[PDB]
Coordinates of N, CA, C and O in Angstrom, one line a residue:
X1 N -3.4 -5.5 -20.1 CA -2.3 -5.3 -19.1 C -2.6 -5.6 -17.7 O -3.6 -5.4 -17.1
X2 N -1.5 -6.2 -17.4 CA -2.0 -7.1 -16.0 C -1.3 -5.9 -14.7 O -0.1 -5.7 -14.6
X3 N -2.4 -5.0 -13.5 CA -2.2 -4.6 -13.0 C -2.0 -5.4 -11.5 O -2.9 -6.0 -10.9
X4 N -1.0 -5.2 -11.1 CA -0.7 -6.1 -9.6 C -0.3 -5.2 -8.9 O -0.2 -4.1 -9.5
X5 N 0.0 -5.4 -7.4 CA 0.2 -5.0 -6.4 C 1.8 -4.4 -6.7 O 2.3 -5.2 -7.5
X6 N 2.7 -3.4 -6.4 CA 4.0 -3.1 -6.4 C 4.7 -2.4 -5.2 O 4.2 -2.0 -4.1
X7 N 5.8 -2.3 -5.4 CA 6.7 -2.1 -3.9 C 8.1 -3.3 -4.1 O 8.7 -3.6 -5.1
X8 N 8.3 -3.8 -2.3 CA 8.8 -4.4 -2.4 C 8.6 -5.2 -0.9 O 8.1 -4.7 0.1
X9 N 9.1 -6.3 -1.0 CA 8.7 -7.4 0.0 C 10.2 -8.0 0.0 O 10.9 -8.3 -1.0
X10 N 10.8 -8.1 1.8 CA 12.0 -9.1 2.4 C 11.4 -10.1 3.1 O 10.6 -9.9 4.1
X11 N 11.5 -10.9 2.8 CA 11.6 -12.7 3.8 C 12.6 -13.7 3.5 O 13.2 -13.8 2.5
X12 N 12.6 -14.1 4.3 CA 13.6 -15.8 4.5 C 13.6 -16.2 3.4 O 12.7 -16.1 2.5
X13 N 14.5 -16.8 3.3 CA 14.6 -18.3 2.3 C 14.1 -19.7 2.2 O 13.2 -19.9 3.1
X14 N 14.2 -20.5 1.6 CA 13.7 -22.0 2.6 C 14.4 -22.2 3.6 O 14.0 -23.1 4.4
X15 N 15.3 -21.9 3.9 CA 16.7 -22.1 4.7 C 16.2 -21.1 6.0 O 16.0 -21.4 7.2
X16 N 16.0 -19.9 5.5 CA 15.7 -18.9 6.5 C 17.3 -18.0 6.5 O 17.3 -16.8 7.0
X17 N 18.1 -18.3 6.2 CA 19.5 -18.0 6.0 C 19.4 -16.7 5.1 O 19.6 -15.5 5.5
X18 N 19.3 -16.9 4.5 CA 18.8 -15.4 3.2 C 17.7 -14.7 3.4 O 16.8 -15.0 4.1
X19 N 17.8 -13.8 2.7 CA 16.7 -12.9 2.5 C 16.4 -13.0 1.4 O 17.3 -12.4 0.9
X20 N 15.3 -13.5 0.0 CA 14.7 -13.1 -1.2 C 13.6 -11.7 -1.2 O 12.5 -11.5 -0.6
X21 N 14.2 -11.1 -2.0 CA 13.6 -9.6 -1.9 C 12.6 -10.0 -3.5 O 12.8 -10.8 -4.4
X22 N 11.4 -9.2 -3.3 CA 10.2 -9.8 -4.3 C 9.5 -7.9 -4.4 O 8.8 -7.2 -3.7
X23 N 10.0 -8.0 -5.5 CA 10.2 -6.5 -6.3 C 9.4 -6.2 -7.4 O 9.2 -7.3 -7.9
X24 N 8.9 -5.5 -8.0 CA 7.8 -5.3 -9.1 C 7.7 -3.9 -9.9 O 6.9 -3.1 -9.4
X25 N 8.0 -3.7 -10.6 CA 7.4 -2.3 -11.6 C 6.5 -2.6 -12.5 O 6.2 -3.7 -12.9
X26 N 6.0 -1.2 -12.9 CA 4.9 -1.4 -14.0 C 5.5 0.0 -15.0 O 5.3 1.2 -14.5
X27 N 6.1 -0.1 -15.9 CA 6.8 0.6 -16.6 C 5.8 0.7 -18.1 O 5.2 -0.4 -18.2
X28 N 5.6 1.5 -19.0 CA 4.8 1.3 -20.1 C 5.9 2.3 -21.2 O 5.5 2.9 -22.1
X29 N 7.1 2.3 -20.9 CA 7.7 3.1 -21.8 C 9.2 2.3 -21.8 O 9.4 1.6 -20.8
X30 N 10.3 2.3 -22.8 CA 11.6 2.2 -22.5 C 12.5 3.1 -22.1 O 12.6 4.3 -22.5
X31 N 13.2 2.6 -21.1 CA 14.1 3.9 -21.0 C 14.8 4.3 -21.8 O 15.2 3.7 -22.8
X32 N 15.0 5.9 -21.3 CA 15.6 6.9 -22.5 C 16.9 6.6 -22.8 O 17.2 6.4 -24.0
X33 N 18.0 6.6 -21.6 CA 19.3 6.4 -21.6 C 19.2 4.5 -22.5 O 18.4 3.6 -22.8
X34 N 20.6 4.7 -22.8 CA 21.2 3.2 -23.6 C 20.8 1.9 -22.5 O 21.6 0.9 -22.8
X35 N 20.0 1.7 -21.6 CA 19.7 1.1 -20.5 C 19.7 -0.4 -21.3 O 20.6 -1.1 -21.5
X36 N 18.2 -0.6 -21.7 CA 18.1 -2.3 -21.9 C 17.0 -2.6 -21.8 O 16.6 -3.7 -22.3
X37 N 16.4 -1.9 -21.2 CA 14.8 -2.8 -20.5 C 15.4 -2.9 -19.0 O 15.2 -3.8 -18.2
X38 N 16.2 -1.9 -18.8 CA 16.8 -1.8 -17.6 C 15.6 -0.6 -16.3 O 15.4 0.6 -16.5
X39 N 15.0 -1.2 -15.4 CA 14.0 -0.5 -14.4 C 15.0 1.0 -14.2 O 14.6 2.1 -14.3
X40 N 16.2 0.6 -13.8 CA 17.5 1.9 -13.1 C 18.4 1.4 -12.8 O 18.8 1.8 -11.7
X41 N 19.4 0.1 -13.7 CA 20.3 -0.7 -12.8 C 20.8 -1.2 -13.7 O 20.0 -1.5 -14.7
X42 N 22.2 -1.6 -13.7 CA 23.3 -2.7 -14.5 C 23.7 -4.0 -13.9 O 24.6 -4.2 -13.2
X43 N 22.8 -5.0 -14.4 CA 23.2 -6.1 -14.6 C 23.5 -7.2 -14.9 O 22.6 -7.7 -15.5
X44 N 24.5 -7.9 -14.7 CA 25.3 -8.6 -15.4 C 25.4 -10.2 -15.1 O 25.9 -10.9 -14.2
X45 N 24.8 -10.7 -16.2 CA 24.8 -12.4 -16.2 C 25.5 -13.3 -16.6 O 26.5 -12.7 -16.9
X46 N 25.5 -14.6 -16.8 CA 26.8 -15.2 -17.2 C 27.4 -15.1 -16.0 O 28.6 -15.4 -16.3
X47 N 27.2 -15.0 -15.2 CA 28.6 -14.6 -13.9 C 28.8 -15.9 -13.3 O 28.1 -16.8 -13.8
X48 N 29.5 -16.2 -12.4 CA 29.7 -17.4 -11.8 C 29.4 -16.8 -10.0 O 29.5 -15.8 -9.4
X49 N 29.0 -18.2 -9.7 CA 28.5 -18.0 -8.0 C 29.0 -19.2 -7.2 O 29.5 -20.3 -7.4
X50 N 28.5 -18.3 -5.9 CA 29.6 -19.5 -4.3 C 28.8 -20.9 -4.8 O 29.4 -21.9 -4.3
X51 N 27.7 -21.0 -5.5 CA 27.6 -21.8 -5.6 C 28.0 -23.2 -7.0 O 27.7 -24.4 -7.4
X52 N 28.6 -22.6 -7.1 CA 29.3 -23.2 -8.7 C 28.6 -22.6 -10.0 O 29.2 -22.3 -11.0
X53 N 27.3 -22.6 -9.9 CA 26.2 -22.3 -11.1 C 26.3 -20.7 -11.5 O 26.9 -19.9 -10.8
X54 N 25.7 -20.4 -12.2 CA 25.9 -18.9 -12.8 C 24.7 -18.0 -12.4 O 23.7 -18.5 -12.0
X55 N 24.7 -17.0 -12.6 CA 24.4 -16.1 -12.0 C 23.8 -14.9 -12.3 O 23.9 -15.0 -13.6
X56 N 23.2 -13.7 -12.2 CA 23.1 -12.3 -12.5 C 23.4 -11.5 -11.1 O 23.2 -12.0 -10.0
X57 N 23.8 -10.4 -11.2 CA 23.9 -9.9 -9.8 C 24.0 -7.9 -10.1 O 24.5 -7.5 -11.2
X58 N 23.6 -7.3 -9.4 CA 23.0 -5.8 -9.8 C 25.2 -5.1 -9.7 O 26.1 -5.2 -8.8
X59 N 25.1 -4.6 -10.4 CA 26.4 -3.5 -10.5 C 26.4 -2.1 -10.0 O 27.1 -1.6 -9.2
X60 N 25.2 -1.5 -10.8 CA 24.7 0.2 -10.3 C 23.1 0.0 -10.5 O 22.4 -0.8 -11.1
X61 N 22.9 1.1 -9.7 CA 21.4 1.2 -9.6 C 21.5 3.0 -9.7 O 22.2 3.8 -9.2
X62 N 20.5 3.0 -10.4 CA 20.2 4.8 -10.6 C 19.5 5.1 -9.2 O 18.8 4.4 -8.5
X63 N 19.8 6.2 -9.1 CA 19.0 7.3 -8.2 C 17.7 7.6 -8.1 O 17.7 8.9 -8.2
X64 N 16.7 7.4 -7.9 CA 15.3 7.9 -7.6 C 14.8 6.7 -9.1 O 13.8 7.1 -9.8
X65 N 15.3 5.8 -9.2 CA 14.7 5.2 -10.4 C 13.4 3.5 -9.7 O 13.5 2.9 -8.7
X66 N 12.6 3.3 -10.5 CA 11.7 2.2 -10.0 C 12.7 1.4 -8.8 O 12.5 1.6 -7.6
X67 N 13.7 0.5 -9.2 CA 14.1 -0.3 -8.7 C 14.9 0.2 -7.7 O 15.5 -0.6 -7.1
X68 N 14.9 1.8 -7.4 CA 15.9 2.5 -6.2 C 14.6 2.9 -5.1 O 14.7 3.2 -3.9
X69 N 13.5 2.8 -5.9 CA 12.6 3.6 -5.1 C 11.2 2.5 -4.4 O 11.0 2.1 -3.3
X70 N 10.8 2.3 -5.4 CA 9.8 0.8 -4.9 C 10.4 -0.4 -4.9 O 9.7 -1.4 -4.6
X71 N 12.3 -0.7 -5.5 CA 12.2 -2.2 -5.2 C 13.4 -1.4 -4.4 O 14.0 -2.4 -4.0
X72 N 13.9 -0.7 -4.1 CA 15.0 -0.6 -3.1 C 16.3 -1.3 -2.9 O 17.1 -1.4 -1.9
X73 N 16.4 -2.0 -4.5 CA 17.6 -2.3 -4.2 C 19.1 -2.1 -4.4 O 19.2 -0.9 -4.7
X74 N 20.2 -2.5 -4.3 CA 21.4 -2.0 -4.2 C 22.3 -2.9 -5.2 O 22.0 -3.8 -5.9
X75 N 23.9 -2.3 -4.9 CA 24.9 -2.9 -5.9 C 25.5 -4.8 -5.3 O 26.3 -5.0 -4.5
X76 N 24.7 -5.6 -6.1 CA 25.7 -6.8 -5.7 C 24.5 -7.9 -5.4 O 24.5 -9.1 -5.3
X77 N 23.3 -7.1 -5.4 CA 22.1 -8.1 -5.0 C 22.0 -9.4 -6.3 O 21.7 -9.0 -7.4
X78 N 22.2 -10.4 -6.2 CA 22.0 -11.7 -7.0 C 21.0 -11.8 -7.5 O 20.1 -12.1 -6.7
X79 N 20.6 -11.4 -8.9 CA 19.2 -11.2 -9.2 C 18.3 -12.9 -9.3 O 18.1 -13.0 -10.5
X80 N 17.9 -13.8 -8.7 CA 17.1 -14.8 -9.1 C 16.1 -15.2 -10.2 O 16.1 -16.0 -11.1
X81 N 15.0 -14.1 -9.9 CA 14.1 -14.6 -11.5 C 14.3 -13.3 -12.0 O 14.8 -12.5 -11.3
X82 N 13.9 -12.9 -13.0 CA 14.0 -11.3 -13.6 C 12.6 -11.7 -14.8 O 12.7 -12.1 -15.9
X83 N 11.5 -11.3 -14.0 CA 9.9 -11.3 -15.0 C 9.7 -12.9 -14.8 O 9.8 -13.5 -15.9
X84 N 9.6 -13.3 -14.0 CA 9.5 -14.8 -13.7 C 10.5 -16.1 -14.6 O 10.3 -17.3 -14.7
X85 N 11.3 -15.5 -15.0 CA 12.8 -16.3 -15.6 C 14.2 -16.5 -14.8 O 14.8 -15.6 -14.3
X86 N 14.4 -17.3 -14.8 CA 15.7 -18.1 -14.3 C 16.6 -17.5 -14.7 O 16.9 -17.9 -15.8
X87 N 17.5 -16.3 -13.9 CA 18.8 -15.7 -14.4 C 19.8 -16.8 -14.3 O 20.4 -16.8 -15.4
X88 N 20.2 -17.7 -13.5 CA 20.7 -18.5 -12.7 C 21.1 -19.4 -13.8 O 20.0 -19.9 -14.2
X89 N 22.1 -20.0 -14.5 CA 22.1 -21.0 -15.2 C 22.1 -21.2 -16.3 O 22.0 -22.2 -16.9
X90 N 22.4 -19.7 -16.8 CA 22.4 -19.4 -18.5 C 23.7 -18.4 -18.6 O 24.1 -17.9 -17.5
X91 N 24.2 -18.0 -19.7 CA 25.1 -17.2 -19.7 C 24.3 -15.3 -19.6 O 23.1 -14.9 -19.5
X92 N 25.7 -14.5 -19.7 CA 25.4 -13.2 -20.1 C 24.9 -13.0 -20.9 O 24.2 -11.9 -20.8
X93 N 24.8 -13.6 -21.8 CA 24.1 -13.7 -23.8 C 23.0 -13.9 -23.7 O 22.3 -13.3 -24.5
X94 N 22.0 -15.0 -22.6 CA 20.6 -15.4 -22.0 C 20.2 -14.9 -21.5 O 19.0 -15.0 -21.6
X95 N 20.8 -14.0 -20.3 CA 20.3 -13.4 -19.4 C 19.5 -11.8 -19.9 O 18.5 -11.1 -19.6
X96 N 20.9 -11.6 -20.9 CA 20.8 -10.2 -21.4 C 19.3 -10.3 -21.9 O 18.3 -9.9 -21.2
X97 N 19.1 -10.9 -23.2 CA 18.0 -11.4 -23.6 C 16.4 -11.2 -22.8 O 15.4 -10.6 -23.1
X98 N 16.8 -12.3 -21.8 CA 15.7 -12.3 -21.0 C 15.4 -10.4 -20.6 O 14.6 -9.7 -21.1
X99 N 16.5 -10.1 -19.8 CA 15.7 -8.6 -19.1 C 15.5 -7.6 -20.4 O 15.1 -6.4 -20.2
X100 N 15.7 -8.0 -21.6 CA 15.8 -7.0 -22.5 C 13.7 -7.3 -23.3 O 12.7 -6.7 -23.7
X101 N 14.2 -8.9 -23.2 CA 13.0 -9.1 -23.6 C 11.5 -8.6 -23.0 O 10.5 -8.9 -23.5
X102 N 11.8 -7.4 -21.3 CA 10.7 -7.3 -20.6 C 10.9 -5.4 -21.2 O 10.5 -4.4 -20.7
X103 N 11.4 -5.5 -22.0 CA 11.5 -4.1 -22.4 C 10.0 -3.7 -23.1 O 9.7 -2.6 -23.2
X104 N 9.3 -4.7 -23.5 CA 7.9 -4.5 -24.6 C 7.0 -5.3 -23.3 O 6.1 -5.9 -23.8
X105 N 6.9 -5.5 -21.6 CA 6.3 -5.9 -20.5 C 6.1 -4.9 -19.7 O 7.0 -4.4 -19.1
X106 N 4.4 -4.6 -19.6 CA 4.2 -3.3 -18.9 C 4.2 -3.6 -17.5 O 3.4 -2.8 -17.0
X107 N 4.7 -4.3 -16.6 CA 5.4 -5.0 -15.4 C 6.4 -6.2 -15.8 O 6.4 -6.9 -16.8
X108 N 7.3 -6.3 -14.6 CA 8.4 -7.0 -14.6 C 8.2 -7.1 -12.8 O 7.7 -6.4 -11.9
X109 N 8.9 -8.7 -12.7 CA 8.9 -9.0 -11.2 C 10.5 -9.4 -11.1 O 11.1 -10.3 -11.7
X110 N 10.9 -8.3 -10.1 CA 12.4 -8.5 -10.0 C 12.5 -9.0 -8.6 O 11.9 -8.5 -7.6
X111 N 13.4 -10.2 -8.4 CA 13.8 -11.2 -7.1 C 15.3 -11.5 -7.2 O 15.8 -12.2 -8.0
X112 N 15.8 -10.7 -6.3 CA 17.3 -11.7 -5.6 C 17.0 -12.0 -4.4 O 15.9 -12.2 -3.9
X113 N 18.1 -12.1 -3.8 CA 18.5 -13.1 -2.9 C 19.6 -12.0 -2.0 O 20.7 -11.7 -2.4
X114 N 19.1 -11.4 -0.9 CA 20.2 -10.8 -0.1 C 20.4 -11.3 1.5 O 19.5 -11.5 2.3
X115 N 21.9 -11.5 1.5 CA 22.6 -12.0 3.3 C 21.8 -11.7 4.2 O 21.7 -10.5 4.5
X116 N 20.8 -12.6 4.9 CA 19.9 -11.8 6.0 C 20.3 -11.6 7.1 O 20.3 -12.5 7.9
X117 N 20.7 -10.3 7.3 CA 21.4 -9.4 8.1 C 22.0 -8.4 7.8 O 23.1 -8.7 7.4
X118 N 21.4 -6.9 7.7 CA 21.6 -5.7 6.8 C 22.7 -4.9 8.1 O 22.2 -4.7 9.2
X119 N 23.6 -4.6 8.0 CA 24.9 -4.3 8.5 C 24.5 -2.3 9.1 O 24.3 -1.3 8.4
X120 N 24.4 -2.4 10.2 CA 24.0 -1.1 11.0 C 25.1 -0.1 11.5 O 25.1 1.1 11.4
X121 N 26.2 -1.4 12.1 CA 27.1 -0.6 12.8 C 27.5 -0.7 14.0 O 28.4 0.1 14.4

């Protein structure tokens, strides 16, 4: 079992326009609820994006769960790789697959892509 660094990391894009958020758990169990190989969050692939190509992007995120707590993320974030796989360009049916398939992976590396500039007020 490969032990790495975890939390969560914001930086630019190549563009610098975005933020890719670079996320990680180490989970050794499946969740109890009907989840998926889900860290604390629903979502949903197959989707379509501003950019023509398809997509995954977060729906809900649980409360005090890995991905609320060390990856900190929220509803709508565009997931990019999910365990170093390409959500981006396959349907719902491929995507599902992939994060389900990190269900038997005692870490997973979760990356979207969020608007850089987090809205204060």
């Amino acid at each position: 079992g490969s032990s790495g660094s975890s939390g969560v990391t914001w930086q630019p894009s190549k563009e610098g326009d975005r933020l890719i958020g670079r996320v990680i758990l180490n989970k050794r169990t499946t969740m109890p609820k009907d989840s998926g190989a889900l860290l604390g969050l629903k979502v949903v692939g197959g989707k379509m994006t501003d950019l023509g190509r398809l997509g995954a992007f977060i729906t809900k995120v649980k409360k005090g769960s890995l991905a609320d707590v060390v990856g900190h993320l929220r509803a709508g974030d565009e997931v990019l790789e999910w365990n170093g796989k390409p959500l981006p360009g396959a349907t719902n049916e491929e995507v599902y697959n992939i994060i389900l398939e990190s269900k038997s992976e005692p870490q997973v590396e979760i990356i979207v892509s969020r608007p850089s500039g987090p809205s204060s007020g």
